Amino acid sequence: VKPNRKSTGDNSNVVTMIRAGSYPKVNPTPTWVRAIPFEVSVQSGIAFKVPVGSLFSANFRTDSFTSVTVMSVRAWTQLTPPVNEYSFVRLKPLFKTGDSTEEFEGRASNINTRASVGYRIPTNLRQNTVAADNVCEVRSNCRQVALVISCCFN
Amino acid sequence: NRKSTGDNSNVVTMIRAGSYPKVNPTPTWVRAIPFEVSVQSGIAFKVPVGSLFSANFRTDSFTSVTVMSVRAWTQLTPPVNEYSFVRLKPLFKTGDSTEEFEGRASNINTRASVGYRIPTNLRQNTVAADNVCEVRSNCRQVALVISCCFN
Amino acid sequence: VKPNRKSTGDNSNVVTMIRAGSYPKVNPTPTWVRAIPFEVSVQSGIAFKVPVGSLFSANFRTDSFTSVTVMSVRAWTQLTPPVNEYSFVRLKPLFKTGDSTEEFEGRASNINTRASVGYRIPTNLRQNTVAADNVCEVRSNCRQVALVISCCFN
Amino acid sequence: NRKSTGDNSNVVTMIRAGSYPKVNPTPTWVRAIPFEVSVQSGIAFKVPVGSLFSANFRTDSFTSVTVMSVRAWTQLTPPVNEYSFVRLKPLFKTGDSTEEFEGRASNINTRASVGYRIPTNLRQNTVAADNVCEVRSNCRQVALVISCCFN
Amino acid sequence: VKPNRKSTGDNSNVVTMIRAGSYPKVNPTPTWVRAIPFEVSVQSGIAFKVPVGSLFSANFRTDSFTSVTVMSVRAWTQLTPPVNEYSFVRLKPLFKTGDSTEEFEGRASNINTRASVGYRIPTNLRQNTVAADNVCEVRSNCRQVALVISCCFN
Amino acid sequence: NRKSTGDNSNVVTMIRAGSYPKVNPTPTWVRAIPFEVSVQSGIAFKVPVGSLFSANFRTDSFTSVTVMSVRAWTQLTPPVNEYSFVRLKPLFKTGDSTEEFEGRASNINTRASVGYRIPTNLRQNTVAADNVCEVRSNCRQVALVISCCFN
Amino acid sequence: NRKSTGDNSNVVTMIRAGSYPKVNPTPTWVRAIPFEVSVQSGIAFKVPVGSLFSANFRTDSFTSVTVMSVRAWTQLTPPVNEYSFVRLKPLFKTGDSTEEFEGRASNINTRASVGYRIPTNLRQNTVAADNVCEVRSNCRQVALVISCCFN
Amino acid sequence: NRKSTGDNSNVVTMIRAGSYPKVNPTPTWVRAIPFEVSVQSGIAFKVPVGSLFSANFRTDSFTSVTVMSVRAWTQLTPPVNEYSFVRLKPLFKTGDSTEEFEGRASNINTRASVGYRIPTNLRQNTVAADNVCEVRSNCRQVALVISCCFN
Amino acid sequence: NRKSTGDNSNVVTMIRAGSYPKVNPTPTWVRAIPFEVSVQSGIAFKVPVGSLFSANFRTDSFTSVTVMSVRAWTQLTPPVNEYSFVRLKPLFKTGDSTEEFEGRASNINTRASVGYRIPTNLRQNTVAADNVCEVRSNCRQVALVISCCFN
Ligand SMILES: [Br-]
Ligand SMILES: [Br-]
Ligand SMILES: [Br-]
Ligand SMILES: [Br-]
Ligand SMILES: [Br-]
Ligand SMILES: [Br-]
Ligand SMILES: [Br-]
Ligand SMILES: [Br-]
Ligand SMILES: [Br-]
Ligand SMILES: [Br-]
Ligand SMILES: [Br-]
Ligand SMILES: [Br-]
Ligand SMILES: [Br-]
Ligand SMILES: [Br-]
Ligand SMILES: [Br-]
Ligand SMILES: [Br-]
Ligand SMILES: [Br-]
Ligand SMILES: [Br-]
Ligand SMILES: [Br-]
Ligand SMILES: [Br-]
Ligand SMILES: [Br-]
Ligand SMILES: [Br-]
Ligand SMILES: [Br-]
Ligand SMILES: [Br-]
Ligand SMILES: [Br-]
Ligand SMILES: [Br-]
Ligand SMILES: [Br-]
Ligand SMILES: [Br-]
Ligand SMILES: [Br-]
Ligand SMILES: [Br-]
Ligand SMILES: [Br-]
Ligand SMILES: [Br-]
Ligand SMILES: [Br-]
Ligand SMILES: [Br-]
Ligand SMILES: [Br-]
Ligand SMILES: [Br-]
Ligand SMILES: [Br-]
Ligand SMILES: [Br-]
Ligand SMILES: [Br-]
Ligand SMILES: [Br-]
Ligand SMILES: [Br-]
Ligand SMILES: [Br-]
Ligand SMILES: [Br-]
Ligand SMILES: [Br-]
Ligand SMILES: [Br-]
Ligand SMILES: [Br-]
Ligand SMILES: [Br-]
Ligand SMILES: [Br-]
Ligand SMILES: [Br-]
Ligand SMILES: [Br-]
Ligand SMILES: [Br-]
Ligand SMILES: [Br-]
Ligand SMILES: [Br-]
Ligand SMILES: [Br-]
Ligand SMILES: [Br-]
Ligand SMILES: [Br-]
Ligand SMILES: [Br-]
Ligand SMILES: [Br-]
Ligand SMILES: [Br-]
Ligand SMILES: [Br-]
Ligand SMILES: [Br-]
Ligand SMILES: [Br-]
Ligand SMILES: [Br-]
Ligand SMILES: [Br-]
Ligand SMILES: [Br-]
Ligand SMILES: [Br-]
Ligand SMILES: [Br-]
Ligand SMILES: [Br-]
Ligand SMILES: [Br-]
Ligand SMILES: [Br-]
Ligand SMILES: [Br-]
Ligand SMILES: [Br-]
Ligand SMILES: [Br-]
Ligand SMILES: [Br-]
Ligand SMILES: [Br-]
Ligand SMILES: [Br-]
Ligand SMILES: [Br-]
Ligand SMILES: [Br-]
Ligand SMILES: [Br-]
Ligand SMILES: [Br-]
Ligand SMILES: [Br-]
Ligand SMILES: [Br-]
Ligand SMILES: [Br-]
Ligand SMILES: [Br-]
Ligand SMILES: [Br-]
Ligand SMILES: [Br-]
Ligand SMILES: [Br-]
Ligand SMILES: [Br-]
Ligand SMILES: [Br-]
Ligand SMILES: [Br-]
Ligand SMILES: [Br-]
Ligand SMILES: [Br-]
Ligand SMILES: [Br-]
Ligand SMILES: [Br-]
Ligand SMILES: [Br-]
Ligand SMILES: [Br-]
Ligand SMILES: [Br-]
Ligand SMILES: [Br-]
Ligand SMILES: [Br-]
Ligand SMILES: [Br-]
Ligand SMILES: [Br-]
Ligand SMILES: [Br-]
Ligand SMILES: [Br-]
Ligand SMILES: [Ca+2]
Ligand SMILES: [Ca+2]
Ligand SMILES: [Ca+2]
Ligand SMILES: [Mg+2]
Ligand SMILES: [Mg+2]
Ligand SMILES: [Mg+2]
Ligand SMILES: [Mg+2]
Ligand SMILES: [Mg+2]
Ligand SMILES: [Mg+2]
Ligand SMILES: [Mg+2]
């Protein structure tokens, strides 16, 4: 059928016609895979529950989502540790179907450096969580902790 | 930087994370936005870029977007005894176009469809006040699907 | 051991003996993978929640099941659209662990034709749902919508 | 007609469905039904096809079934000093059979087992009023497993 | 760098130095994959609900876990059947998201032998369960039933 | 003995189990236990095996453990103007060792690290009353990671 | 080209027969005949060949038979404390044998079995009046399976 | 070496031009010109070539044109009960043709289309006064697409 | 054939020794000896070889030693504002050297390190009274590691 006509082709500098056909399947409000960096405050000796509602905010463009499937969690000490000590952080995953008892701990080897640790959620436990829910318990000698949660907004 | 999929893992597994990586809380996003614009008979309508920024598309947190290509479809029936048709005239801040990319329907009961691509060199940002393209048609509304890149 | 005896062999027209052994593991009430076509009524501008209890009925032979793992959902406009308009349908999946916000929309390109759309549930979200639960919200300019839900009865 | 498995998808994904397919709300079903029938000493019992239709097997919504093959096992101990045994005589509407497929136990503490296949040419439907096969045995009950096709 | 020094090498009979580096990521309370054999009592004609709390006990070393992801379930008749009968056992899986209706039955071919049966949980249904929850309903002519549950403690 | 993974199964599936297998309700367990021990200046401390048995490590149900290898790290800052250091002296019931596996830090702001392996021939059990190794250091505490096998 | 059978017909076709063939309304027939015989403790029982001519076996229309092999199993439990056993002494019209082919059960609850082949050169017909073999055993009944040629 | 364009520049470079070339401010141009023409029922309409010279097409600066091919579609619905149809009779200054290249729609709601190629040896210029072809049809309007060479 | 060791023994075996060999109760020994030496600011310290003969190193039974290489690290923090540094001037009984092999830390919190090899032809014994090298540095203490041959 005289193969192709159109205008120019590939390496071009002008508008070119698109020979559309049938109206396609669309979606104005799709899903989105994201890594949300945010900080949380932590006292000494007390485990802070990281709420899922912190992922939902306009500071991440996600204030339009009402549910999230968490995949992995990573956390860095945000501040310096007490005098003479090396930073440290722990993570206990929490699941609406059953809270786990792990304390995935990572320590720093230099006092001036951040302590880092993180955990992966298996596929059979990636389920939606709402703002009211909590993702995990954080502990640390440091007063603030920076997280980077890899999750799927839908 | 040690993550896997397809694995047989049915429990949590520790990730040996190290240095705080480079992050971004407001990343960009390539989208194919759908929305409809009403039109009149024989009168052109300037589609304002400001319809791509809205909470109905999760984009009310953006102010500037790089349009890439437009595709238009008629949304309502055409006048009596007429076949549907729609025309697209690109519009750019640096100098409007005089093209009228027209597509007609070969069955009155069908939508008319057309689109145009914006070459790489003309892919600059546009804000809400700017325009995208003129849309003529004999059909009282028109449905668009604009592939773009929010930033 | 004189290989095989029996009667005839393969291309046969008479009863043939079966040299059974130990009573096997059985199951009088097994699982079943199905695609259940049913219609639902839809008003204009109002999202109708498709109840899971509609899959459970004797019209599908499934009135003997009390739970179902939904996999995918597909929907067609069952009636004609308003005057001058083209049919359209939307689907917002619902999950007991967290309702999603997608509006998977599919439109027709001919007024006389059905509009079609559908979505797939990932593996990590295939979990049982009971009659009381709902699968998704349907919207459309058409008054009835025909669905075909692929699911696993157990 | 675009569905996958094993995928790394952890969110819903749109399916580009088109024409309303061919459907069936009451499809067929191949089954291996288990049930037990009591028996007497030296007296044959005509297993009625109507035991395969019941809500205990999810089949009370069927009326006709294509039997394919029968397999029998004794369900209770045999008389004292005896070894278990069971006989199967096929029964068809078009003309009963005189076979007596017999299987015996070589250990008194074991079940006797036997079965028969129905060739393709004799695989017609049967309703509740019809019979399947005569079952003789010295054991007070008998357990069956009938591979069939409900329709 | 003069490749390796150390002491002896591989086939050795004395302590050897380990040239450690940075403090690693640790975990004092990890997960554990286990197969927990325990018995349950069963009446005649009555289905007994196997509680998840039976997996949590110091007799399995697991009295330190508060959640469990069940994978598969296997069960053997623990005692002899009534007079003149052959042992038998059934299993109906139970899920907090929706109880199933299967009756996976396995029978013995010798009266003096155990009847055995079991079922596998798909990946999409491996979710945590707490002590309060139940795994499945057991039936049998025998008064006791021995199970061996393959599960993942976390 | 018929179990699979990676399968497309989304419903329960029957397992054809047979004979009651060999079981064990209290199996063994290889572990890498972490804990910290305080230390003084110039004085050695005998790490008691009894710190590996505790509910904080899920091991309070064990009484005997086969140590395999020790690795030590300083847990607090060193004295002023000093670099961190730690020494490990293996201890065995059959005859203590006189080695002093020492590791120092090349940056005052860094931990000192060292470890030792126990050869196969010296891998016997140890109970709570036994000792593991002497730990010297200029740092007020020390953090250990003992690979072992509980039984 | 199809699913089942496929091209076959599926309706009748004509056969172009020729000359009238050779026929036989009363052919031979090779069988495995099952039947039991009572046995006294410490007495040998002469099995009659006329037990092979019976309508139970569809063979009441035969008067002769060519015996190939004799297999025997114990049919009832043995005396207390005793394991089952059975012996077979072959008998021929041309000269009786003296072998006592015996077999014993290793489990009191199991059948004792044995059998013997008759060689080609001893395979002649035997009428109802004849005897095939002598049976000795501690169980009262003994089941037999005889592969033979009815003619 | 990069992502988009890569090595290019990205800023201007100098061209080392030479002698002043041959130029043409007013070149030729090959086009596909779209336009409609009203048609009466049962009357043939002579299409004027001067419909190809218009600013709507950027061609008001041309006075001649070399026509290659003529394609026609029906633009309005047909009378009731009737299927659309259109006929094209070519016209040439050297001798008018007599072919009525016709086309019919198979669906009343669809356009009837047809067209004809003009061979090389009949491809001469045609001024506005000339005619290209006669159009007959049952629909009142008929849209045309003409591939031609403006010069 | 097994898991660990496997075939070995696992119990003692006999050795079929022969003539009485050549023995040496007091062999040589190659070592890396660690020890520190105090250093004054702006003064060179003569390291005595008699620091290599000590029971801390199991070498109190030696009287001579053949030095191969000398490596040095700073043991205490440098003055304020200053980066660590250390210099090594070799010394030999046949003629002292004049090289000041120096090394500097690039980070104030890090050790300054340097070392020098002694070539074969200068590797003779050295008694306790002798000196191995002169040390200069801004830190007060300086740790040494010397690869040498005790004999
Ligand atoms: Br271009
Ligand atoms: Br398109
Ligand atoms: Br599409
Ligand atoms: Br989508
Ligand atoms: Br991100
Ligand atoms: Br990241
Ligand atoms: Br605090
Ligand atoms: Br703490
Ligand atoms: Br702080
Ligand atoms: Br919580
Ligand atoms: Br603290
Ligand atoms: Br790696
Ligand atoms: Br696992
Ligand atoms: Br990382
Ligand atoms: Br990075
Ligand atoms: Br990344
Ligand atoms: Br980014
Ligand atoms: Br994107
Ligand atoms: Br999109
Ligand atoms: Br609107
Ligand atoms: Br118009
Ligand atoms: Br607007
Ligand atoms: Br610009
Ligand atoms: Br046959
Ligand atoms: Br079988
Ligand atoms: Br089986
Ligand atoms: Br099953
Ligand atoms: Br279906
Ligand atoms: Br389907
Ligand atoms: Br309505
Ligand atoms: Br609406
Ligand atoms: Br309607
Ligand atoms: Br809901
Ligand atoms: Br509406
Ligand atoms: Br495809
Ligand atoms: Br995903
Ligand atoms: Br489809
Ligand atoms: Br289809
Ligand atoms: Br299908
Ligand atoms: Br079907
Ligand atoms: Br089936
Ligand atoms: Br079945
Ligand atoms: Br019954
Ligand atoms: Br009987
Ligand atoms: Br009955
Ligand atoms: Br029939
Ligand atoms: Br060694
Ligand atoms: Br290490
Ligand atoms: Br690590
Ligand atoms: Br771990
Ligand atoms: Br285990
Ligand atoms: Br096991
Ligand atoms: Br009871
Ligand atoms: Br029961
Ligand atoms: Br009992
Ligand atoms: Br999964
Ligand atoms: Br329950
Ligand atoms: Br019972
Ligand atoms: Br296998
Ligand atoms: Br499945
Ligand atoms: Br098993
Ligand atoms: Br085993
Ligand atoms: Br195992
Ligand atoms: Br074990
Ligand atoms: Br282990
Ligand atoms: Br561990
Ligand atoms: Br402590
Ligand atoms: Br010290
Ligand atoms: Br202690
Ligand atoms: Br020992
Ligand atoms: Br023929
Ligand atoms: Br013939
Ligand atoms: Br014959
Ligand atoms: Br034959
Ligand atoms: Br036979
Ligand atoms: Br007797
Ligand atoms: Br006797
Ligand atoms: Br006797
Ligand atoms: Br007789
Ligand atoms: Br004789
Ligand atoms: Br012969
Ligand atoms: Br150039
Ligand atoms: Br030039
Ligand atoms: Br030119
Ligand atoms: Br051109
Ligand atoms: Br053109
Ligand atoms: Br007219
Ligand atoms: Br007309
Ligand atoms: Br006409
Ligand atoms: Br004109
Ligand atoms: Br003319
Ligand atoms: Br020409
Ligand atoms: Br030797
Ligand atoms: Br020797
Ligand atoms: Br020597
Ligand atoms: Br040596
Ligand atoms: Br050494
Ligand atoms: Br000084
Ligand atoms: Br100084
Ligand atoms: Br100096
Ligand atoms: Br000295
Ligand atoms: Br000298
Ligand atoms: Br030399
Ligand atoms: Ca938003
Ligand atoms: Ca039913
Ligand atoms: Ca414990
Ligand atoms: Mg570090
Ligand atoms: Mg339209
Ligand atoms: Mg369409
Ligand atoms: Mg029986
Ligand atoms: Mg058995
Ligand atoms: Mg330290
Ligand atoms: Mg017997």
Ligand SMILES: [Mg+2]
């Ligand atoms: Mg027309």
Ligand SMILES: [Mg+2]
């Ligand atoms: Mg220094």
